[PDB]
Design an enzyme around this catalytic site. Structure first.
Site, mmCIF file in Angstrom:
data_model
loop_
_atom_site.group_PDB
_atom_site.id
_atom_site.type_symbol
_atom_site.label_atom_id
_atom_site.label_comp_id
_atom_site.label_asym_id
_atom_site.label_seq_id
_atom_site.Cartn_x
_atom_site.Cartn_y
_atom_site.Cartn_z
ATOM 1 N N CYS A 196 40.929 -106.858 49.813
ATOM 2 C CA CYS A 196 40.838 -107.211 48.604
ATOM 3 C C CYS A 196 41.823 -105.680 48.192
ATOM 4 C CB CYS A 196 39.928 -106.332 48.041
ATOM 5 S SG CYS A 196 38.596 -105.014 49.200
ATOM 6 N N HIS A 234 33.732 -105.088 58.698
ATOM 7 C CA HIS A 234 32.828 -104.534 58.043
ATOM 8 C C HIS A 234 31.728 -105.075 58.060
ATOM 9 C CE1 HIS A 234 35.763 -103.923 54.699
ATOM 10 N NE2 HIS A 234 35.984 -105.977 55.127
HETATM 11 C C1 LIG Z 1 43.326 -110.584 50.798
HETATM 12 C C2 LIG Z 1 41.597 -110.448 51.354
HETATM 13 C C3 LIG Z 1 41.095 -110.359 50.138
HETATM 14 C C4 LIG Z 1 39.650 -110.638 49.928
HETATM 15 N N1 LIG Z 1 38.869 -110.171 48.817
HETATM 16 C C5 LIG Z 1 37.526 -109.948 48.038
HETATM 17 C C6 LIG Z 1 37.016 -109.704 47.536
HETATM 18 O O1 LIG Z 1 37.043 -109.091 46.527
HETATM 19 N N2 LIG Z 1 35.333 -109.315 47.426
HETATM 20 C C7 LIG Z 1 34.395 -110.278 48.532
HETATM 21 O O2 LIG Z 1 33.139 -109.989 48.319
HETATM 22 N N3 LIG Z 1 35.667 -110.400 49.434
HETATM 23 C C8 LIG Z 1 36.967 -110.455 49.546
HETATM 24 N N4 LIG Z 1 37.119 -110.935 50.750
HETATM 25 C C9 LIG Z 1 36.793 -111.132 52.166
HETATM 26 C C10 LIG Z 1 36.225 -110.349 53.126
HETATM 27 O O3 LIG Z 1 36.954 -109.259 53.297
HETATM 28 C C11 LIG Z 1 35.147 -110.796 54.740
HETATM 29 O O4 LIG Z 1 34.269 -111.257 54.085
HETATM 30 C C12 LIG Z 1 35.237 -109.711 55.258
HETATM 31 O O5 LIG Z 1 36.210 -108.900 55.389
HETATM 32 C C13 LIG Z 1 34.526 -110.129 56.868
HETATM 33 O O6 LIG Z 1 34.185 -108.683 57.032
HETATM 34 P P1 LIG Z 1 33.679 -109.410 59.153
HETATM 35 O O7 LIG Z 1 33.437 -108.018 59.026
HETATM 36 O O8 LIG Z 1 32.342 -110.390 58.724
HETATM 37 O O9 LIG Z 1 34.682 -110.122 59.327
HETATM 38 P P2 LIG Z 1 36.693 -109.342 59.223
HETATM 39 O O10 LIG Z 1 37.003 -109.119 58.903
HETATM 40 O O11 LIG Z 1 37.004 -110.592 60.108
HETATM 41 O O12 LIG Z 1 36.241 -108.629 60.779
HETATM 42 C C14 LIG Z 1 36.197 -109.360 62.079
HETATM 43 C C15 LIG Z 1 36.454 -108.523 63.331
HETATM 44 O O13 LIG Z 1 36.704 -109.267 64.469
HETATM 45 C C16 LIG Z 1 37.470 -108.749 65.432
HETATM 46 N N5 LIG Z 1 38.063 -109.922 66.422
HETATM 47 C C17 LIG Z 1 37.767 -111.107 66.573
HETATM 48 N N6 LIG Z 1 37.663 -111.228 67.510
HETATM 49 C C18 LIG Z 1 37.457 -110.631 68.489
HETATM 50 C C19 LIG Z 1 37.991 -110.694 69.871
HETATM 51 N N7 LIG Z 1 37.587 -111.542 70.475
HETATM 52 N N8 LIG Z 1 37.692 -109.202 70.512
HETATM 53 C C20 LIG Z 1 37.840 -107.783 69.622
HETATM 54 N N9 LIG Z 1 37.470 -107.648 68.736
HETATM 55 C C21 LIG Z 1 37.446 -109.647 67.597
HETATM 56 C C22 LIG Z 1 38.684 -109.532 64.361
HETATM 57 O O14 LIG Z 1 39.997 -108.136 64.589
HETATM 58 C C23 LIG Z 1 38.221 -108.155 63.354
HETATM 59 O O15 LIG Z 1 38.769 -107.243 62.960
HETATM 60 C C24 LIG Z 1 38.525 -110.670 50.620
HETATM 61 C C25 LIG Z 1 39.678 -111.391 51.923
HETATM 62 C C26 LIG Z 1 40.816 -111.230 52.334
HETATM 63 C C27 LIG Z 1 41.490 -111.619 53.483
#
Ligand SMILES: Cc1cc2nc3c(=O)[nH]c(=O)nc-3n(C[C@H](O)[C@H](O)[C@H](O)COP(=O)(O)OP(=O)(O)OC[C@H]3O[C@@H](n4cnc5c(N)ncnc54)[C@H](O)[C@@H]3O)c2cc1C
Ligand SMILES: Cc1cc2nc3c(=O)[nH]c(=O)nc-3n(C[C@H](O)[C@H](O)[C@H](O)COP(=O)(O)OP(=O)(O)OC[C@H]3O[C@@H](n4cnc5c(N)ncnc54)[C@H](O)[C@@H]3O)c2cc1C
Ligand SMILES: NC(=O)C1=CN([C@@H]2O[C@H](COP(=O)(O)OP(=O)(O)OC[C@H]3O[C@@H](n4cnc5c(N)ncnc54)[C@H](O)[C@@H]3O)[C@@H](O)[C@H]2O)C=CC1
Ligand SMILES: NC(=O)C1=CN([C@@H]2O[C@H](COP(=O)(O)OP(=O)(O)OC[C@H]3O[C@@H](n4cnc5c(N)ncnc54)[C@H](O)[C@@H]3O)[C@@H](O)[C@H]2O)C=CC1
Lengths: 449, 450
Positions: B43, B11
């Site tokens: 989610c 995201h």
């Molecule tokens: C079941 C579940 C339900 C949720 N429900 C809610 C909700 O209802 N409301 C809400 O506000 N939040 C919710 N969340 C929280 C929300 O999903 C997370 O905060 C969000 O995914 C964070 O997004 P991000 O892009 O920062 O990180 P991430 O989703 O963790 O994505 C980070 C990406 O970086 C990749 N990556 C990491 N290291 C490397 C590397 N060395 N090289 C290449 N790629 C790499 C990973 O593959 C990953 O895809 C939920 C989370 C979960 C697990």
């Protein structure tokens, strides 16, 4: 001890009295009210007529007995005839036996409210033209509705809109007249009212917009309503073309707006420092323009009543002003707004722009979702939010209060575009629809650079 | 052209990339992501398992192809192995053929997110212990739920709470374990969680609160979860005991919180002025305490991603911080909060008091109404609002956003007690229930002065 006279007691008087007795329990509070009831919630009239109120006694939240028991000297069925601020007396008439008395006061609380606007039109005394304000009026409408198949609602403000909807869903033949070109023109912009008018047409309501009644004429088969553009036959005409402050007792004695609304400082004190005003007798401090305005709503009465009680002896709590947040439910749609419409901002010469946004309120992958139609009105240069509106089959009413708080704090479209709001797909997308709305306002200002 | 490398794309990377490309169309953006998808809404996992999602492709809002079409150089199935800030290089592995390459960057966007906490416990490698984070995990759960009648959810935070409810309503025997004495202790005070816990019991969920797993042991007829106070036989254990920032690539190289969350300035810049962080890799600025914290929510990712895009070249838009507003639906109850619980405020030595109010959200003369249980947490001296929560069978979720804006503007209980809110009996009483809540806080402060 301190002598307090309260003129009028529906909502503002009720809250003022309870607040005065709680914070100055030695004071001698006398209240006069023409009616024999207090605290009737007029919002219940349309709800009753629409078949939604089982027991109409539930539409009262207090009573004379309750106020009496709290320590007030309660004089129902009394009409205040004169107020003499120089001698600090009131002259009152007992309506049961006509007896007049004159009493002294140290502080007077003007919670005399409003009365419907009744134009000087030929035939307006007809038994088939009724008001829709108080409990007396409600009882008459409850009785008439059974025999009145054809109903003409005069005025398409909030009262008329709610009545027309209530009568139309209960099998009546409804005609809705307004002098302006749209329904509820004060509260929503055209993108909203176009949708509402289509709803009215879909439900069989006859719209007669841009029309003013010239005369009422009784006939053998009912009441004939002649406008400047047409003639309508009806069994019952309801007059709801706005409120006039009921303040003649003080005309020429305290500062008033052109329409008679009492002007107050931030403590609800009139130009006469011993005379307070609260509710529909008083102007509001309208935050979006920082001007006095007259936008009578129960929300003003309960708040200003409390403030009179807090400020009775010395200034203690400042009035926060209002955004005049308001809304209603029509045909399963929730429709809410706060602050200025674009139409009103432009009419008043303000620097204002608007975005309209329609989005589903939560993600399409859910079992269901609903479009929400949204409006944000803002200053394109300072980016200050001036008003906003939301309309949906999903109950979005609480979002108008979020916008109200934004306006109260002078927030900008940039604040709203990014301020923290929760995400859960039962409730919204990752950005709340209010964030999305404000982001579209950003995009409009950015395109203008 | 400015060369931009984005590490990780669920995201925060997605929003950063779209914002960067929109504001600087010429910049050369390369994004590396381990998975073969982006924008999966985690989610949706509980919702799918609960029978609430028809087509799970609806749980993706973007795609590699869309970012490519928009001008990004999209390198899916790549794993970033190293980042050297001094040389401004990244070393990357193509997971399909192990081919390594090293690339230079002008700006690096650390959107590497987080990974579930996995403790060092005997037997945790069992095939019957599953994670619940990404699209791979979701598909595995979707298959295994068909046969596993007994489910043990380890962790009673938001994920665990939602999983337990989803499995309980689709006919499973659910046991919900938390190390803490209450479910969702971070998010609500005990008056709320007492009600939720009773809800779980009424629906046949077995609560195992105040317990920590000591070992997983495969047994003849399932998996044996041993805690310090009991033992449970299950067909599937789900480990959802929190998130860890997935930031080891930069450990030692930029200022971090104790758990590894990257500290940023108000422009989402790390202590290295060419490395930005957004999303679960980053700490938030938590407004109620004015301190960095780690409360990973998708709301942070979408916002900080945008801010990265706006601040990549020069500081343009300041980060407003957050109240960590959050909530969920459990068994027909809407439960939402923002800011500090009373328990959290006092655990951190803040001067704080609370009022709990239960009122019907609209008048009893209407055809129906619903109680709403409300909490307001506030500083009794300054009157500043520190946090609040609402729970009702009526959807009160938007009121948590109202409170969030109150806290964002440093409003007091006195502000909220009287601020204009609409009245219509379809929606509320003459005073909105949030006004009523703050008026009760006023009454509490008044009683304590004499
Ligand atoms: C079941 C579940 C339900 C949720 N429900 C809610 C909700 O209802 N409301 C809400 O506000 N939040 C919710 N969340 C929280 C929300 O999903 C997370 O905060 C969000 O995914 C964070 O997004 P991000 O892009 O920062 O990180 P991430 O989703 O963790 O994505 C980070 C990406 O970086 C990749 N990556 C990491 N290291 C490397 C590397 N060395 N090289 C290449 N790629 C790499 C990973 O593959 C990953 O895809 C939920 C989370 C979960 C697990
Ligand atoms: C059908 C209808 C529906 C409404 N729906 C809503 C809604 O949904 N939401 C909302 O916010 N607002 C609504 N309103 C507006 C709200 O009802 C008014 O703002 C409210 O009644 C004003 O309260 P008040 O106490 O200030 O004045 P009032 O209700 O006007 O009462 C003032 C009292 O003073 C008495 N009085 C006046 N002069 C004298 C005198 N000389 N001597 C003795 N007594 C006197 C009068 O008898 C009167 O009872 C509605 C109004 C109507 C008519
Ligand atoms: N849901 C809510 O918030 C409700 C609040 N109220 C408020 O009570 C007060 C009175 O309500 P309303 O009577 O509806 O007043 P209003 O101010 O809301 O609407 C009056 C309507 O009458 C029109 N009008 C004025 N003179 C006319 C004339 N001679 N002929 C035809 N049309 C004419 C106007 O164009 C206007 O649309 C208002 O302030 C209203 O906002 C009343 C009902 C519901
Ligand atoms: N509706 C929403 O807002 C949701 C948001 N999220 C967020 O995703 C992030 C991760 O979610 P969660 O995994 O639920 O983390 P969490 O921080 O919400 O809860 C983790 C739970 O596990 C407990 N715990 C910690 N260690 C434990 C141990 N060794 N043994 C047993 N229990 C232990 C903790 O007491 C805590 O209650 C959180 O920030 C969460 O808020 C996730 C799902 C839904």
């Amino acid at each position: 001890s301190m002598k307090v006279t309260v003129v009028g007691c529906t909502h503002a008087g009720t809250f003022a009295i309870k607040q005065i007795l709680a914070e100055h329990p030695d004071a001698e509070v006398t209240v006069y009210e023409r009616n024999d009831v207090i605290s009737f919630l007029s919002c219940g009239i349309a709800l009753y007529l629409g078949g939604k109120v089982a027991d109409p006694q539930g539409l009262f939240y207090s009573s004379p007995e309750e106020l009496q028991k709290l320590g007030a000297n309660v004089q129902m069925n009394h009409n205040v005839l004169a107020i003499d601020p120089d001698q600090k007396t009131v002259t009152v008439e007992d309506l049961t036996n006509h007896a007049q008395t004159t009493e002294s006061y140290d502080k007077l609380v003007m919670t005399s409210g409003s009365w419907p606007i009744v134009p000087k039109i030929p035939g307006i005394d007809s038994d088939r033209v009724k008001l829709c304000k108080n409990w007396a009026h409600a009882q008459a409408l409850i009785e008439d509705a059974k025999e009145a198949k054809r109903i003409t609602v005069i005025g398409a403000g909030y009262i008329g809109a709610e009545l027309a909807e209530a009568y139309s869903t209960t099998g009546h033949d409804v005609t809705l007249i307004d002098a302006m070109a749209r329904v509820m023109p004060k509260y929503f912009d055209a993108d909203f009212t176009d949708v509402i008018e289509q709803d009215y047409r879909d439900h069989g309501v006859q719209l007669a917009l841009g029309e003013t009644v010239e005369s009422f004429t009784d006939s053998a088969t009912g009441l004939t309503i002649k406008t400047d553009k047409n003639s309508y036959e009806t069994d019952l005409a309801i007059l709801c073309i706005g409120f006039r402050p009921n303040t003649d007792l003080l005309k020429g004695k305290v500062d008033m707006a052109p329409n008679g609304a009492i002007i107050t400082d931030d403590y609800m004190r009139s130009s006469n420092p011993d005379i307070f005003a609260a509710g529909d007798s008083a102007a509001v401090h309208y935050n979006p323009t920082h001007q006095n305005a007259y936008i009578p709503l129960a929300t003003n009465a309960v708040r200003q009543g409390i403030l009179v009680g807090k400020n009775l002896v010395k200034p203690t709590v400042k009035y926060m002003g209002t955004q005049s947040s308001s809304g209603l439910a029509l045909y399963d749609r929730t429709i809410v707004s706060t602050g200025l419409t674009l139409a009103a901002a432009k009419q008043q010469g303000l620097n204002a722009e608007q975005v309209i946004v329609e989005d589903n309120y939560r993600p399409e992958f859910m079992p269901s979702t609903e479009p929400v139609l949204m409006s944000l009105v803002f200053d394109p240069d300072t980016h200050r939010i001036l008003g906003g509106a939301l309309m949906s089959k999903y109950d979005v009413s609480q979002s108008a209060n979020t916008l109200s708080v934004c306006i109260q704090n002078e927030n900008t479209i940039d604040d709203l575009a990014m301020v923290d709001m929760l995400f859960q797909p039962n409730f919204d997308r990752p950005f709340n629809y209010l964030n999305i709305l404000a982001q579209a306002a950003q995009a409009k200002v950015a395109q203008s650079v």
